[PDB]
Amino acid sequence: PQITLWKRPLVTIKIGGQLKEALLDTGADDTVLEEMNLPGRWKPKMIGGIGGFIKVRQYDQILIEICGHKAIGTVLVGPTPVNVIGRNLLTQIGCTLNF
């Protein structure tokens, strides 16, 4: 799709068999989701945003479908204010900025 930006670019995602809403965030290097249950192993990781650093659970090679487009990559899980899809997965679904 072509998505204008008068509203937040929110889309439905499928991860671990569960549907969720997430923000397409070109300013995020990484994909960070709010606390949830995800199967498999994970590693403690630190990520920094506008207000400082937080602890997250890093899940590697996770299947995630974004607006009908499949991706397989790293998903960070922790106290982010909102679910964000970052560039690590935006590149997989072929997302570009255009103006």
Ligand X SMILES: CCC(CC)CN(C[C@@H](O)[C@H](Cc1ccccc1)NC(=O)O[C@H]1CO[C@H]2OCC[C@H]21)S(=O)(=O)c1ccc2c(c1)CC[C@@H]2O
> DSSP letter at 42?
-
Question: CA-to-CA distance for 74 and 68, rounded, in angstroms?
Answer: 18
Does an H or E element contain 90, and which?
helix 87-90
Question: CA-to-CA distance for 99 and 89, rounded, in angstroms?
Answer: 21
Q: Is 44 in the site for its own copies (CB under 8 A)?
A: no
Shorter beta-carbon distance to its own copies: residue 39 or 97: 97
Q: Considering only the stretches 12-20, 34-42, 57-65, 85-93, report the one whose residues sit in contact with its own copies under the rule CB under 8 A.
A: 85-93
Our answer to whether residue 29 is catalytic in this structure is: no
Q: Is 20 in the site for its own copies (CB under 8 A)?
A: no
Q: Going by C-beta distance under 8 Å and a sequence separation of 6 or more, which residues neighbour residue 38?
A: 15, 16, 57, 59, 62, 75, 77
State which of positions 11-30 bind ligand X (CB under 6 A).
25, 27-30
- Of 33, 62, 75, 90, which one interacts with its own copies (CB under 8 A)? 90
Q: Is 87 in the site for its own copies (CB under 8 A)?
A: yes
Give the catalytic positions in this structure. Answer: 25
